[PDB]
Amino acid sequence: LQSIIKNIWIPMKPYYTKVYQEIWIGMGLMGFIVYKIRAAD
Amino acid sequence: NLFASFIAPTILGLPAAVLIILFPPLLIPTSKYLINNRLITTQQWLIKLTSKQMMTMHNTKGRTWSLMLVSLIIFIATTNLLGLLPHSFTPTTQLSMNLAMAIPLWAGTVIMGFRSKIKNALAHFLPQGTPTPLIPMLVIIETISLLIQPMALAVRLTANITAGHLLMHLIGSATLAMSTINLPSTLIIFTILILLTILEIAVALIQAYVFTLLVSLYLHDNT
Amino acid sequence: VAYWRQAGLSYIRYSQICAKAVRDALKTEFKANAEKTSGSNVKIV
Amino acid sequence: DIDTAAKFIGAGAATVGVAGSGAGIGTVFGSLIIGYARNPSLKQQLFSYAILGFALSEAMGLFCLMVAFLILFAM
Amino acid sequence: DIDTAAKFIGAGAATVGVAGSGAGIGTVFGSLIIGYARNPSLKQQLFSYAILGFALSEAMGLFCLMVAFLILFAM
Amino acid sequence: DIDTAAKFIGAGAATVGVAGSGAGIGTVFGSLIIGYARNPSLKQQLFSYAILGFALSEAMGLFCLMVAFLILFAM
Amino acid sequence: DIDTAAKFIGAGAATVGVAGSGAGIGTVFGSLIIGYARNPSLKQQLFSYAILGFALSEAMGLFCLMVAFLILFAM
Amino acid sequence: DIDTAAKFIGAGAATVGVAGSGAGIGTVFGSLIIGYARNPSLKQQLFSYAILGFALSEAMGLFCLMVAFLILFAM
Amino acid sequence: DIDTAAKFIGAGAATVGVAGSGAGIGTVFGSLIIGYARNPSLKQQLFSYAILGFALSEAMGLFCLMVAFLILFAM
Amino acid sequence: DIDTAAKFIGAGAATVGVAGSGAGIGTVFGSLIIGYARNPSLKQQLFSYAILGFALSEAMGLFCLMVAFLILFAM
Amino acid sequence: DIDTAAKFIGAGAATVGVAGSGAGIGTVFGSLIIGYARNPSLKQQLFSYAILGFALSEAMGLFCLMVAFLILFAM
Amino acid sequence: QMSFTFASPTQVFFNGANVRQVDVPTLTGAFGILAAHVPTLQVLRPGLVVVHAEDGTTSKYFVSSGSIAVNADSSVQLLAEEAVTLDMLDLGAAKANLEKAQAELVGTADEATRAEIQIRIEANEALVKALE
Amino acid sequence: KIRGILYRTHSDQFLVAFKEVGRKPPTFGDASVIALELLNSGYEFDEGSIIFNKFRSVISYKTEEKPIFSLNTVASADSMSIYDDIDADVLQNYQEYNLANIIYYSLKE
Amino acid sequence: PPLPEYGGKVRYGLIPEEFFQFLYPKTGVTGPYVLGTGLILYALSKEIYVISAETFTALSVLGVMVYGIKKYGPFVADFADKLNEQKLAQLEEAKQASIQHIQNA
């Protein structure tokens, strides 16, 4: 629970929170697409 | 028997695609020093140059993605250039990884243009200088065009590695087949193979840079 | 390579002719002062 | 059967028609290179006409491609 | 049957013929880019000739396309 | 039967040949754009040569098209 | 029969080959437009070379067309 | 059987469509040669537009190629 | 029989390949028009290179044509 | 059998696709001629871009060719 | 039999692919005409690049042609 | 960024002044010059020139035969032997001049003098269409 | 005056002279004429220099020597590879017209 | 902390000198060589290394890489070194200037 937030999350907070929002929306879209694909098999 | 090099790898029953995909970063060491070794010297020069190339053409809201775009090009280029080693599983040849690199970024930049930029974004769906009588289905083109952007991206890589690899592979076969028949024909096929390998190096680098640049253009159009 | 070059005319002659044509096409209010502000007087020896 | 066979053949034939869009896009962006090296101060209008031409080229190419996918997977 | 099969094949073949219109439109708008970067003050006459050429290119392309749809869905 | 089937296939193949006229018309009017942006005072002679070239291109295209309609609906 | 069927198919295929002459004529007259807008005082020599190139293009196109009519109506 | 046969035929037909991307890339880099010999100081912008056009050309070419591999090895 | 049928089909296919020579000759003589309107004093050297290019284009076209006549009337 | 037959047909069709690379290489080196006659002091950069364009053209051509050899001798 | 029939069809299809080399040679020598009329003092370097481009175009064309002769007379 | 120097021998209309775009009727075509235009040097032929000022308004002149030079430094020198305005010229005299010109043209038969009459004709006709 | 004062000095090296310049204010026609008879001379010079009295102001003048190039080396000059659309013809026209321009400007100076 | 002036004394870009010095006392100088050749012959003899197309694509890429090094290597080496020297000299001429500033004040 430590260092995972000290060297991994505090430098990526400005990106994961503010810059990559629509990136996460797109990742949700991609996950739905992949679920539907692997399901239709 | 032929697509074996693209079959998902495994060792001792374990999924060794993990160790393959996570390795390229291990080739970029970092340091806090000011005068460091030759490796990090050249690598920082290359990243400086690549950043100057990619991100210059953006406003600030675009330049926020500098980390993302440079990490993208570095990851893809190292993966491709690690693909050229013998008996190596190139994880870009997979459609999965490329779809997962393509749909997020493109969808993100389109939605970013939609959150802000909203009138601008719904207007760029149409070239404005267009005359009236078929403005309507013209935008149908554009809309369709838009939704083909991501797939294309992924596809645009998945082949030009896959194909490329197969390509070299087969000439290998060929020269091996001619290894026992006509020595000079073997030599000239070997020379074809050499020139081919050089072309493959170049096309690996180019495809990395191209994926990056196209995502960059979508960004700049949606900021 | 236009025709007047193949006919042998230097560009100087071309510009002379065009400027004289424009000058003769001026209204006579400006034609005189123009035509002698540009008319030549050198003699060749 | 004969029907699935002919559907495969017709899909291949239909998809042949992308070659024209490939070449048209090549020409558009080659011209753009030239027009830029000719007057590198209309970059935005040049690039706008570039996207427009590319859009129409891709319109034709995707017409062909959807026809492939219409006769293949739908009809 | 054999008739529906050949109708599918002929529709694919007929639709191949759009490639020419795709490439022709590509050329038209590439030339328009160039002609604009050459004399950016005849924009309206350049663009008029642009539409005209595009219209004839699309005339041929739609000829091909309707022939596809005539042999496919009508004959 | 086999004959109607092959007539459909041959009609599709024959109609493929309009692609060349599509591309030729594209080239003609693209060149016209360029030649106009080059010397916008021969507009009538440029446009006359334009209609002439377009006429010959359409001559070939309609040759192809009538051949389609000759083997399809007549023979 | 099978022979008339293949004759129809081969006639369509053979006639495909006009596309090249269509595009070649398009290029010839587009270049003529350009060369005229470039030096509008060699009109007769430009036009002579125009008819010459068009003649050779039509030579090839009619070769293709006669081959269509040779395999179709004669052989 | 008939199905594997038609899959081979359709794969060949589909792969025909790379010709357009080959020619489009040829045109892109030929134009790049010309635009460089015209103003050899925009090398980076010329080359960027070069990569962009080549990328779209290869986009179409790989579309065709994957369609070949989709109808051949997958469908 | 099946053999004469396939010979007809292959002859048509082989003859398709003249389209390239048609278009190549079109390009050669269009370029010649342009190069003449550009420097109308090298007429003999321009025309010599013209006949040379036309000769190679016709070399390829006649290769295709003889192949048609070889598989048709000889093999 | 039917399978070897269709493999031959598909190999021929697949190999058709080299035509695009032939024409693209023609264009690349023609443009190189022009760009050299335009500024004969960038010979090394012109020639570098020449080999690059030729390399991509041959990339597409060899894609087509190996597809021919893949469906013919391997599949 | 069916095998000789398909070999004829595949040979015709394979030989189609010369069209690209025909057009590429046409473009090469047309460009050469233009580049000569543009700077008639690099004749030897222009002509060297001419033979080089023609050589690569013929390389592709003969690839296609040998494939025709390989599937026809050898396989 | 544009350094424009439209200058007759005995007059100066611009000198380093900043304008947005100009048009020029060069022997080898009528085109437009804007900032950072690729370096060019050409000789003119009779016809209009339209300077687009930075404030958007267009000053129209009519040049007879000069020479334009667009340098690497965005400098654009346009030296025209006869620069005019468009009210300074008439229509009837230009028309009559062109008429008698082509009359003498089909009258005249020697090559060099034929070219001279043809140049007079081209100047007069560029002028007659620049008229109205 | 210059022809008189240098004719017995270098008559063997002498091409042509012009008179009735100085009475009337020189114009462009003067330059067009002098350039014409400089070109119709058939003497295509490797290079040239015009020598005149650059007006500094009312009291001082400086004997200046301006250069004049030929078609050959203005074409050969690598610096001219940045300019476009240029060949023997357009550089020829430009060189002739610049000869006329520099003669006019020198007469005025 | 400073950085050592050299690396690890590798031979043939694949083997460090530690191995040669480690096998020398109990095999001599030709020992590593004979071990390598024996292992190679046993590897490609008992078909544990199948000679296939990959063998020839590997020979191609290895020839390309060895030529790439032996040609464009020293250039990249001294280029990185010149980058470093330029940065160092710039920083030192950036120290001197501020010393001069304070003295002038």
UniProtKB/Swiss-Prot annotation, chain C:
The keyword Hydrolase applies. It is found in: Mitochondrion; Mitochondrion inner membrane. The keyword Ion transport applies. One of its GO terms (molecular function) is proton-transporting ATP synthase activity, rotational mechanism. GO terms for biological process: proton motive force-driven ATP synthesis; proton motive force-driven mitochondrial ATP synthesis. Keywords: Acetylation, ATP synthesis, CF(1), Disease variant, Hydrogen ion transport, Hydrolase, Ion transport, Membrane, Mitochondrion, Mitochondrion inner membrane, Primary mitochondrial disease, Transport. Ubiquitous. The modification N6-succinyllysine is found at K20, K31, K36. The modification N6-acetyllysine is found at K20, K31, K36, K43. GO terms for cellular component: mitochondrial inner membrane; mitochondrial matrix; mitochondrion; proton-transporting ATP synthase complex. Component of the ATP synthase complex composed at least of ATP5F1A/subunit alpha, ATP5F1B/subunit beta, ATP5MC1/subunit c (homooctomer), MT-ATP6/subunit a, MT-ATP8/subunit 8, ATP5ME/subunit e, ATP5MF/subunit f, ATP5MG/subunit g, ATP5MK/subunit k, ATP5MJ/subunit j, ATP5F1C/subunit gamma, ATP5F1D/subunit delta, ATP5F1E/subunit epsilon, ATP5PF/subunit F6, ATP5PB/subunit b, ATP5PD/subunit d, ATP5PO/subunit OSCP. Belongs to the eukaryotic ATPase epsilon family. This is ATP synthase F(1) complex subunit epsilon, mitochondrial. It comes from Homo sapiens (Human). The lineage of its organism: Eukaryota, Metazoa, Chordata, Craniata, Vertebrata.
From Swiss-Prot, chain L:
GO terms for molecular function: proton-transporting ATP synthase activity, rotational mechanism; structural molecule activity. Keywords: Acetylation, ATP synthesis, CF(1), Disease variant, Hydrogen ion transport, Ion transport, Membrane, Mitochondrion, Mitochondrion inner membrane, Primary mitochondrial disease, Transit peptide, Transport. One of its GO terms (cellular component) is proton-transporting ATP synthase complex. The modification N6-succinyllysine is found at K100, K129. Its main location: mitochondrion. The keyword Mitochondrion applies. The keyword Repeat does not apply. Changing V70G: In MC5DN5; no effect on protein abundance; decreased mitochondrial proton-transporting ATP synthase complex assembly; decreased aerobic respiration in patient cells homozygous for the mutation; partial loss of function confirmed by complementation assays. It is found in: Mitochondrion; Mitochondrion inner membrane. The modification N6-acetyllysine is found at K100, K129. GO terms for biological process: aerobic respiration; mitochondrial proton-transporting ATP synthase complex assembly; proton motive force-driven ATP synthesis; proton motive force-driven mitochondrial ATP synthesis; response to copper ion. Belongs to the ATPase epsilon chain family. This is ATP synthase F(1) complex subunit delta, mitochondrial. The gene is ATP5F1D. The chain holds residues 37 to 168 of 168 of the full protein.
From Swiss-Prot, chain M:
Isoform Heart is expressed specifically in the heart and skeletal muscle, which require rapid energy supply. Isoform Liver is expressed in the brain, liver and kidney. Isoform Heart and Isoform Liver are expressed in the skin, intestine, stomach and aorta. The modification N6-acetyllysine is found at K19, K62. The modification Phosphoserine is found at S11. It is found in: Mitochondrion inner membrane. The modification N6-succinyllysine is found at K19. Belongs to the ATPase gamma chain family. Subunit gamma, of the mitochondrial membrane ATP synthase complex (F(1)F(0) ATP synthase or Complex V) that produces ATP from ADP in the presence of a proton gradient across the membrane which is generated by electron transport complexes of the respiratory chain. ATP synthase complex consist of a soluble F(1) head domain - the catalytic core - and a membrane F(1) domain - the membrane proton channel. These two domains are linked by a central stalk rotating inside the F(1) region and a stationary peripheral stalk. This is ATP synthase F(1) complex subunit gamma, mitochondrial.
Swiss-Prot record, chain N:
The modification N6-succinyllysine is found at K87. It comes from the Eukaryota. The modification N6-acetyllysine is found at K95. It is found in: Mitochondrion; Mitochondrion inner membrane. Subunit b, of the mitochondrial membrane ATP synthase complex (F(1)F(0) ATP synthase or Complex V) that produces ATP from ADP in the presence of a proton gradient across the membrane which is generated by electron transport complexes of the respiratory chain. ATP synthase complex consist of a soluble F(1) head domain - the catalytic core - and a membrane F(1) domain - the membrane proton channel. These two domains are linked by a central stalk rotating inside the F(1) region and a stationary peripheral stalk. Component of the ATP synthase complex composed at least of ATP5F1A/subunit alpha, ATP5F1B/subunit beta, ATP5MC1/subunit c (homooctomer), MT-ATP6/subunit a, MT-ATP8/subunit 8, ATP5ME/subunit e, ATP5MF/subunit f, ATP5MG/subunit g, ATP5MK/subunit k, ATP5MJ/subunit j, ATP5F1C/subunit gamma, ATP5F1D/subunit delta, ATP5F1E/subunit epsilon, ATP5PF/subunit F6, ATP5PB/subunit b, ATP5PD/subunit d, ATP5PO/subunit OSCP. Belongs to the eukaryotic ATPase B chain family. This is ATP synthase peripheral stalk subunit b, mitochondrial. The gene is ATP5PB.
